[PDB]
């Protein structure tokens, strides 16, 4: 144990936790309590610290470097796949939700309708077999925790400033984070690119938003730092409110909308009725720059990401061989009816493989294979468990947790000028065995 944090004497942790709880209040590491009924609609009431790991867990410096250089590679890959409507339409037209999303994509295709931007997130985990950094998810739409992840960097750096050498650790190895500034800056640059100085930013939000303070903070940054107004509306409000003018400008609550920032619309529970599908359509048709576009949203679906990971598919959207190499190194293997992996690599050694739907099947039952629900074959990831202190509604407890590190990218282009393509900070979600937020403690 190098810091198996469970060892730390229970007297010194009453104090660290105490300080951790102070800092979170002072710095708005706060969310609506689930237990309080209005805390997702009324700000300023029913507030509570984000559930949190007290001290950061370890992540090799090299694999953190690796994730950092992937960030702009994934950005350009997401833009490239999104430009292929036939790949997208072929792949996915095989789920009422997805099929509704594809409609909207078709409609645009049908109508030949660029300033393109993204604020996206690639989630990784370290795998104990290969010792590799592996991509777990690419989030192309409405990525949370740009603020949270970067208050956490601050929290843990504070804690370590106070308690470090008393524990063997230096804040230095909690990496610097700018996720939320990069985010608001990507937005401000897009608004600039549209070059309507009268335009506001639309931020599409959920009816119930306990995490509303992350959003207000980005809006505060936009307003005070970038001098740009933003307005927050639910999809059903955009259906009642929103109009397109005869020249294709979006007008929501009496103002031009140059940028549409989604922090909603990624779940089917966001579209209770036809009003919300109208609104998504209305907005997509408009000349507003969408953060992100419907094509981007589709790239991010489970189905597209699986298809990307199959042998030879990825390499269709990437010409750079160094990048090709980098991508494939973080991609967990995934396959269909290949006799070679999928009869027999997996039959002998059912150890990795898991079969998943396009129940999971593992281990001895994965001799499903000996007989040819779970439609594709992929490589098993074995995660790093580590001892943690978990602070929740003011109370701590110990557990052994796994961590998922997500790297933000921002991207902005106007037909062939790349204005932004960036690694833009991180967050970490740490969970038992929906968990807590965290950081990493490099190598």
Ligand X SMILES: N[C@H](CCC(=O)N[C@@H](CS)C(=O)O)C(=O)O
Annotation: binding site for substrate: 121, 215, 404, 429
User: How deeply is 44 buried, as exposed, middle or buried, from its count of CB atoms within 10 A (0-12, 13-18, 19+)?
Assistant: exposed
Ranges within 93-122 binding ligand X (CB under 6 A): 121
> Taking contact as CB under 6 A, which single stretch among the options 64-72, 82-90, 92-100, 273-281 is the one that binds ligand X?
64-72
* In the complex, minimum distance from the CB of residue 299 to ligand X, in angstroms, rounded to a whole number: 13
Q: Can you tell me the distance from the alpha carbon of 343 to that of 348, in angstroms, rounded to the nearest whole number?
A: 9
> The dihedral of CA 29, 257, 408, 358: what is its sign?
positive
Q: How many CA atoms lie within 13 A of 60 on its CB side?
A: 13
CB closer to ligand X out of 24 and 153: 153
Give the number of residues in contact with ligand X, rule: CB under 6 A.
Answer: 19
> Taking contact as CB under 8 A, which single stretch among the options 38-46, 93-101, 107-115, 281-289 is the one that binds a second copy?
38-46
Number of neighbouring beta carbons within 10 Å of residue 120: 27
Dihedral (Cα; 430, 431, 437, 441), 10-degree rounding: -20
* Residue from 16, 30, 202, 250 binding a second copy (CB under 8 A): 30
User: What residues pair up with 407 in beta bridges, in sequence order?
Assistant: 122, 426
* In the complex, minimum distance from the CB of residue 211 to ligand X, in angstroms, rounded to a whole number: 4
* Residue from 53, 75, 82, 142 binding ligand X (CB under 6 A): 142
> Taking contact as CB under 6 A, which single stretch among the options 84-92, 109-117, 124-132, 139-147 is the one that binds ligand X?
139-147
Give the CB-nearest residue to ligand X.
Answer: 68
- Is residue 240 at the binding interface for a second copy, with CB under 8 A as the rule? no
CB closer to a second copy out of 147 and 298: 147
Q: Can you tell me the distance from the alpha carbon of 403 to that of 386, in angstroms, rounded to the nearest whole number?
A: 9
Would you give the binding string for ligand X spanning residues 398-427, x where CB under 6 A is met? ------------------------------
Binding partner of 211, given ligand X, a second copy, none, CB within 5-8 angstroms per partner class: ligand X
- Is residue 61 at the binding interface for ligand X, with CB under 6 A as the rule? yes
Would you give the binding string for ligand X spanning residues 313-352, x where CB under 6 A is met? ----------------------------------------
- Is residue 302 at the binding interface for a second copy, with CB under 8 A as the rule? no
* In the complex, minimum distance from the CB of residue 80 to ligand X, in angstroms, rounded to a whole number: 21
* In the complex, minimum distance from the CB of residue 44 to a second copy, in angstroms, rounded to a whole number: 3
* Residue from 4, 37, 38, 432 binding a second copy (CB under 8 A): 38
List all residues 6 or more positions away from 344 whose beta carbon is below 8 Å from its beta carbon: none
CB closer to a second copy out of 308 and 391: 391
CB closer to a second copy out of 26 and 373: 26
- Is residue 49 at the binding interface for a second copy, with CB under 8 A as the rule? yes
Ranges within 236-265 binding ligand X (CB under 6 A): 263
Binding partner of 322, given a second copy, ligand X, none, CB within 5-8 angstroms per partner class: none
* Residue from 87, 163, 194, 213 binding a second copy (CB under 8 A): 213
CB closer to a second copy out of 48 and 117: 48
Binding partner of 68, given a second copy, ligand X, none, CB within 5-8 angstroms per partner class: ligand X
* Whole-Å CA distances, 126 to 59, 356, 363: 8, 20, 21
Instruction: Note the residues at the interface with a second copy (CB under 8 A).
Output: 18, 20-22, 24-28, 30, 38, 42-49, 212-213, 216-217, 220, 393-394
Instruction: Note the residues at the interface with ligand X (CB under 6 A).
Output: 61, 64-65, 68, 121, 139, 141-145, 175-176, 206, 209, 211, 214, 263, 266
């Amino acid at each position: 144990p190098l810091f198996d944090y469970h060892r730390i004497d229970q007297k010194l942790l009453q104090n660290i936790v105490y300080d951790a709880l102070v800092w979170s209040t002072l710095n708005c590491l706060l969310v609506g309590d689930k237990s309080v009924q209005r805390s997702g609609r009324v700000p300023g009431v029913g507030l509570v610290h984000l559930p949190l790991s007290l001290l950061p867990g370890p992540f090799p410096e090299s694999h953190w470097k690796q994730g950092c250089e992937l960030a702009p590679i994934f950005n350009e890959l997401v833009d490239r796949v999104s430009l292929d409507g036939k790949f997208l339409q072929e792949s996915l037209s095989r789920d009422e939700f997805t099929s509704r999303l594809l409609d909207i994509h078709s409609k645009m295709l049908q109508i030949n309708k660029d300033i393109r931007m993204g604020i996206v997130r690639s989630d990784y985990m370290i795998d104990e077999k290969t010792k590799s950094l592996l991509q777990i998810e690419m989030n192309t739409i409405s990525t949370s925790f740009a603020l949270i992840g970067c208050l956490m960097t601050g929290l843990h750096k504070s804690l370590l400033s106070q308690y470090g050498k008393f524990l063997g650790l230096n804040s230095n190895r909690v990496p610097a984070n700018n996720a939320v500034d990069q985010s608001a800056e990507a937005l401000a640059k897009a608004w600039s690119e549209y070059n309507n100085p009268r335009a506001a930013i639309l931020v599409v939000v959920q009816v119930e938003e306990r995490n509303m303070y992350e959003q207000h903070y980005i809006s505060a940054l936009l307003r005070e730092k970038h001098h740009i107004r933003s307005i927050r509306k639910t999809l059903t409000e955009i259906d009642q409110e929103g109009k397109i003018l005869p020249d294709g400008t979006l007008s929501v609550d009496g103002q031009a909308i140059s940028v549409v920032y989604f922090r909603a619309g990624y779940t089917p529970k966001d579209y209770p009725s036809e009003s919300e599908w109208r609104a998504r359509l209305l907005m997509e048709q408009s000349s507003a720059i969408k953060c992100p576009t419907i094509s981007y949203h589709l790239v991010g679906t489970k189905k597209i990401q699986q298809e990307l990971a199959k042998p030879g598919v990825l390499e269709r959207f990437v010409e750079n061989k160094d990048h090709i190499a980098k991508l494939r190194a973080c991609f967990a293997g995934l396959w269909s009816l290949e006799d070679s992996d999928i009869v027999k690599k997996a039959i002998e050694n059912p150890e990795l493989f898991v079969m998943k739907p396009q129940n999971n099947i593992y281990g001895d039952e994965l001799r499903e294979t000996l007989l040819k629900a779970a439609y594709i074959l992929m490589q098993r990831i074995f995660p790093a468990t580590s001892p943690a202190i978990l602070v929740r509604d003011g109370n701590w407890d110990t557990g052994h947790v796994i961590s998922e590190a997500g790297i933000f990218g921002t991207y902005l282009r106007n037909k062939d000028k790349i204005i932004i393509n960036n690694e833009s900070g991180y967050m970490v979600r740490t969970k038992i065995s929906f968990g807590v937020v965290d950081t990493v403690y490099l190598t």
